[PDB]
Ligand binder design. Structure first.
Ligand SMILES: COc1ncc(N2CCOc3ccc(CN(C)C)cc32)cc1NS(C)(=O)=O
Length: 862
C-alpha cells in the first residue's frame, strides 16, 4: 500500500511523466502493455534476487574485456582486502589469471595474520578500487580492459579482494521490496471533416491518402476534391483505393497529408488498419494531426497528444461484415502458403547466383528471385532480405507463400538480422524473425548496437512488441544495458511522438529494479542541480567578469543542497565510474554561447583513477556527437579485432534531456590551438611555430619517453584521418583537435558529418606530418609507416562496410537533420568505396591520400 504509492511517485519523478496520465488515457492497448510488461519485469527481478554470487557479479559488474580477447610480461599489482588499510604489492605475469593473483594475496594475508586461512581463492572477486568494476573468470590479466589500460599508461593496478558474502550482501540489499480473405471489395473510407485547420483563406484544402506497407505503396495514392480554406472543412466523401480488403497485409498503414493549394504543407496523420488485437478497424476515427515540416509513411501511427491546438481529421472506416474480422492466425496463413510450385536451367541457376551474391533489380530479375524462392531458402538463406523486397505485399496469396518459407527459414547471422530491423521490412513475422536471430547477440555486441535498437522502437506500430520485450529482458539481465536503455529513453521524454512509448518502457523497467530506479533518481537529482547551476552561469556571465561568475558558481555549489545532490553518484556516462567528492575549486565553465560547465570529482578510495570530470551542456544538442563517437569506438573495436591498436580516444557523450547531456572530460590534454599559441616563458616556447607541438610533446615526455609519444601521435593521427574521412567530419580546425600528454591526438565537436553538403576530402595537416616525421623535413621511413597505418585502418573498415551501412540506416529513425535520407547513406557508400573491389578501393584511397599530401605541401612550400 504505502510502498507501492511511494514507488509510483518515484517512477513518475524519474521518467518525467506522472503515472496517473497513463490511467487517464483509458487506452486498452496502454493498459495491457502496462500489466503484461510489469509481470515480465517482476519475474526477471525474482530470478535475479536468487542468482548465485558469481552470476550476480555478471549482472551488476559485467566484465570489461579487450576486443581481441572476446570469444610473458612482468606486472606489479597492489591488492588489499575490503575495509583494510593495509595492502600488498607483488609481481605477476600479464598471462596470469585472477585466481592465481587471489591465491597469492591469500597466502600473504595468512602469513601476516599468522593463521592458516579457511578462505580459498574461489570465494573471492577482485574489485577495481573505488569503481563498480570487477576482475573475475578464467581470463589472463592482460585480456581485461583495466589491466590493459594500466600496462599502456605505466600505472600500477589497485585491486580489492571482495568475499562472496559481501557480494551476496549487495544482492540482498538491492532487492525489490516485498474471414478477411473472402472480402474482395476495394478498400474505401469516408473522409468526413477537418477541425482547427490553419491556412491562407485565398487557397483551397486537399487531403492526400495512401496505403503503405512500410515505405512501399500498396496501391496508388488518392486525393480528395478541392474545398475552400476554413477552420472546419467538410468533405463527407468516399475515397476508394485500388486494392481489395482481402489483400491488406497485417502491417498496412493508412497515411494522410492535409495541404493547401493555389504547395503549402499543413499536417499529416497515420494509422494501422488492424489494431493490436488483430481486429480490422471499423467506425469513426478522429485523427489528431502532426504539423508538416507530403505523405509520411515512416511517421508515428499514434495521434498528436496536443488535442487543444492540433488540426484534426475525422474519418469513417466502414463495417465490412456484421461480425468483427481479425487477421488470419498463423495456422491459416501456413495452410494457404504451403501450396505452390518449385524448375530452372543450369544457366539461369548461374543468373540467380549472380544477382543474389550481388542492390536494386530490374523487373525481370525480381520475377526470377520470386520463382526461385525455394532455392533462395535452401541455398542462399542470407539472401532473405532480397526475396522479402521482391514479395508482392499487396497480394495475400504471395504473402502466405513468403510467410510459409520464413517460418522454416534458418537463423541468420547478426549482420543479416540488423538489416531486417529496417522499416523496409515492416511485417511483424519478419520483425519477430529478426529478433530471434539477434538473441545470440553477446552483451558487448548488444551494448555496441543499443543506440540503433532504441531508435528502431520509433518504427514499431504497436506498444507490446518483441523488440521491447527483448530490450527489457536484456536490460534486466545486465545492469549496464539497463542503465543505457534508461538514459536513451529518458533523453527523449520531451518528444511528444515517443513520450508515451518511452515512458511506458521506463515504468516496466523500474518495476523490474526498484534499487536501480533509486540509483538513477540520484543521477537525475545531480542533473537537475547542474541545469539550475548552468542557468545561473548563463545569466551572471552577461552581467559581470569571468572570475566573478566563477566565484558565484562556486558559492552556489557550496550550498548543502548542491553538495548533497552533486556528490556520490554513478556517472550517467559510465555506471562503472563513481563520481564521489565534487571538487568545487576545480569547477568552471566554458566561454561559448551556452556556457557549458566543467565539473571535477575526486575519490580517495579510487586514488588517481577517481580524479574524473564531466562537462554539462544545456542548449546544444549532443545526439550527433554521441553517434559519431559510438561509430569511432566501433572502428576502434574492429581495428583491435585485427590486432591493430590506433590509440583512439572515444570519450563518453550522452544526451540526458531536452538539449541536455554530459561529455566525459579527457584530462592531461589540450587543443592544438592552445599549444600553438606559443606563449612565452613556457617549457614548449619555439623558434618556429611548426616546432610548438613537438616541443610540447618533448616537455611532457622527457628522455626516452619522446619516442613512445611520437608513435602514439602517429597511430591516433592515422585512426582519426581515416575516421573523419569515412564519416565526412567537416569544420576541422585547431580548437576541435586535441592532444593528450601521452602523444595521442583525438577530435572533438562532431556537430557536422556525412559531408554537411560537400564531399569532404581526405585531410593531411603539415603540423601533424611534421611530428610524424620526428621534426625532420624529409622522413619517408616514418611518413610511409603512417600511410601504411591509414591504408590498413581503411581496408579493415571496408570489410565491415555493411555493418556501418545497416547501423546508419537504422539511425535514420533518430530524426537527426544530417541523417534524413538515402543521400546521407550514399556518402558512407562512397567514402568506403563499397561498390568496388579491395584493389580498386585501395587505388582510390591512395589517389585521395596523395591529393591530401599535395594539399599539405602548399603549407610545406612556406
Ligand atoms: C561538443 O563539445 C565538446 N566536445 C568534446 C569536449 N571534450 C571532451 C573531452 O575532454 C575535453 C577536454 C578539453 C576540451 C577543450 N577545452 C577547451 C574545454 C574539450 C573536451 C568538450 C566539448 N565542449 S566544450 C568543453 O568545448 O565546451
Amino acid at each position: 500500500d504505502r510502498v507501492k504509492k511511494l514507488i509510483n511517485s518515484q517512477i513518475s519523478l524519474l521518467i518525467g511523466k506522472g503515472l496517473h496520465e497513463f490511467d487517464s488515457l483509458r487506452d486498452p492497448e496502454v493498459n495491457d502493455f502496462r500489466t503484461k510488461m510489469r509481470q515480465f519485469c517482476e519475474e526477471a527481478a525474482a530470478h535475479r534476487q536468487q542468482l548465485g554470487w558469481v552470476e550476480w557479479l555478471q549482472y551488476s559488474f559485467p566484465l570489461q574485456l579487450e576486443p581481441s580477447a572476446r570469444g610473458n610480461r612482468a606486472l606489479l599489482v597492489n591488492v588489499k582486502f575490503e575495509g583494510s588499510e593495509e595492502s600488498f604489492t607483488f609481481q605477476v605475469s600479464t598471462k596470469d589469471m585472477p585466481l592465481a593473483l587471489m591465491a597469492c594475496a591469500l597466502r600473504k594475508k595468512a602469513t601476516v595474520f599468522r593463521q592458516p586461512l579457511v578462505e580459498q581463492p574461489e570465494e573471492y572477486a577482485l574489485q577495481v578500487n573505488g569503481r563498480h568494476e570487477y576482475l573475475y573468470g578464467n581470463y589472463p590479466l592482460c585480456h581485461f580492459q583495466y589491466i590493459c589500460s594500466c600496462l599502456h599508461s605505466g600505472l600500477t593496478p589497485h585491486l580489492t579482494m571482495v568475499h562472496s558474502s559481501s557480494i551476496l550482501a549487495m544482492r540482498d540489499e538491492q532487492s525489490n521490496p516485498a474471414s478477411l480473405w473472402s472480402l474482395e471489395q476495394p478498400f474505401s473510407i469516408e473522409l468526413i471533416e477537418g477541425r482547427k485547420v490553419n491556412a491562407d483563406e485565398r487557397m483551397k484544402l486537399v487531403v492526400q491518402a495512401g496505403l503503405f506497407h512500410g515505405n512501399e505503396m500498396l496501391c496508388k495514392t488518392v486525393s480528395s476534391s478541392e474545398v475552400n480554406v476554413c477552420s472546419e472543412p467538410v468533405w463527407k466523401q468516399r475515397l476508394e483505393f485500388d486494392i481489395s480488403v482481402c489483400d491488406l497485409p497485417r502491417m498496412a498503414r493508412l497515411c494522410f497529408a492535409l495541404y493547401a493549394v493555389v504547395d503549402c504543407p499543413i499536417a499529416w496523420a497515420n494509422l494501422m488498419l488492424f489494431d493490436y488485437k488483430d481486429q480490422l478497424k471499423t467506425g469513426e476515427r478522429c485523427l489528431y494531426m502532426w504539423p508538416s515540416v507530403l505523405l509520411n509513411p515512416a511517421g508515428t501511427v499514434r495521434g498528436n497528444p496536443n488535442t487543444e491546438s492540433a488540426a484534426a481529421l475525422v474519418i469513417y472506416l466502414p463495417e465490412v461484415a456484421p461480425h468483427p474480422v481479425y487477421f488470419p492466425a498463423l495456422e491459416k496463413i501456413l495452410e494457404l502458403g504451403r501450396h505452390g510450385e518449385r524448375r530452372i536451367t543450369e544457366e539461369e541457376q548461374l543468373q540467380l547466383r549472380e544477382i543474389l551474391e550481388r542492390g536494386e533489380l530490374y523487373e525481370h530479375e525480381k520475377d526470377l528471385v520470386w520463382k526461385m524462392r525455394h532455392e533462395v531458402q535452401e541455398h542462399f538463406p542470407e539472401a532473405l532480405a532480397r526475396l522479402l523486397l521482391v514479395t508482392k505485399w499487396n497480394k495475400h496469396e504471395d504473402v502466405a507463400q513468403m510467410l510459409y518459407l520464413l517460418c522454416s527459414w534458418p537463423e541468420l547471422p547478426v549482420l543479416s538480422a540488423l538489416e531486417l530491423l529496417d522499416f523496409s521490412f515492416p511485417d511483424c513475422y519478419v520483425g519477430s524473425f529478426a529478433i530471434k536471430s539477434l538473441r545470440k547477440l553477446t552483451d558487448d555486441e548488444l551494448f555496441q548496437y543499443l543506440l540503433q535498437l532504441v531508435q528502431v522502437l520509433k518504427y514499431e506500430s504497436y506498444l507490446d512488441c518483441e523488440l521491447t520485450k527483448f530490450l527489457l529482458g536484456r536490460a534486466l539481465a545486465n545492469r549496464k544495458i539497463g542503465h543505457f536503455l534508461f538514459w536513451h529513453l529518458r533523453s527523449e521524454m520531451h518528444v511528444p511522438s515517443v513520450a508515451l512509448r518511452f515512458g511506458l518502457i521506463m515504468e516496466a523497467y523500474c518495476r523490474g529494479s526498484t534499487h536501480h530506479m533509486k540509483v538513477l533518481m540520484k543521477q537525475g537529482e545531480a542533473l537537475s542541480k547542474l541545469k539550475a547551476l548552468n542557468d545561473f552561469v548563463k545569466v551572471s556571465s552577461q552581467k559581470t567578469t569571468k572570475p566573478q561568475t566563477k566565484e558565484m558558481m562556486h558559492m552556489c555549489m557550496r550550498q548543502e543542497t548542491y553538495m548533497e545532490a552533486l556528490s556520490h553518484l554513478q556517472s550517467p556516462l559510465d555506471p562503472s565510474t563513481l563520481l564521489e567528492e565534487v571538487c568545487v575549486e576545480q569547477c568552471t565553465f566554458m566561454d561559448s554561447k551556452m556556457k557549458p560547465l566543467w565539473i571535477m570529482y575526486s575519490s580517495e578510495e579510487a586514488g588517481s583513477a577517481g580524479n574524473v570530470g564531466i562537462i554539462f551542456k544545456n542548449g546544444d544538442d549532443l545526439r550527433q556527437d554521441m553517434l559519431t563517437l559510438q561509430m569511432i569506438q566501433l572502428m576502434d573495436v574492429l581495428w583491435k579485432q585485427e590486432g591493430l591498436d590506433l590509440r583512439m580516444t572515444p570519450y563518453g557523450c550522452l544526451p540526458t534531456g531536452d538539449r541536455t547531456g554530459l561529455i566525459e572530460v579527457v584530462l592531461h590534454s589540450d587543443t592544438i590551438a592552445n599549444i600553438q599559441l606559443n606563449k612565452s616563458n613556457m617549457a614548449a616556447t619555439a623558434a618556429f611555430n611548426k616546432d610548438a607541438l613537438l616541443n610540447w610533446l618533448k616537455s611532457k615526455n622527457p628522455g626516452e619517453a619522446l619516442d613512445r609519444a611520437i608513435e602514439e601521435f602517429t597511430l591516433s593521427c592515422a585512426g582519426y584521418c581515416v575516421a573523419t574521412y569515412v564519416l565526412g567530419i567537416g569544420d576541422r580546425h585547431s580548437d576541435n583537435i586535441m592532444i593528450r600528454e601521452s602523444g595521442q591526438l583525438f577530435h572533438i565537436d562532431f556537430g557536422h558529418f556525412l559531408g554537411n553538403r560537400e564531399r569532404v576530402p581526405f585531410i593531411l595537416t603539415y603540423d601533424f606530418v611534421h611530428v610524424i616525421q620526428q621534426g625532420k623535413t624529409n622522413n619517408s621511413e616514418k611518413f610511409e609507416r603512417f600511410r601504411g597505418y591509414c591504408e590498413r585502418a581503411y581496408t579493415i573498415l571496408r570489410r565491415h562496410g555493411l555493418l556501418f551501412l545497416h547501423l546508419f540506416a537504422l539511425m535514420r529513425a533518430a530524426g537527426l537533420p544530417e541523417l534524413s535520407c538515402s543521400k546521407d547513406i550514399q556518402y558512407l557508400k562512397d567514402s568506403l568505396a563499397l561498390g568496388k573491389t579491395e584493389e580498386e578501393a585501395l587505388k582510390h584511397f591512395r589517389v585521395k591520400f596523395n591529393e591530401a599530401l599535395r594539399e599539405s605541401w602548399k603549407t610545406k612550400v612556406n
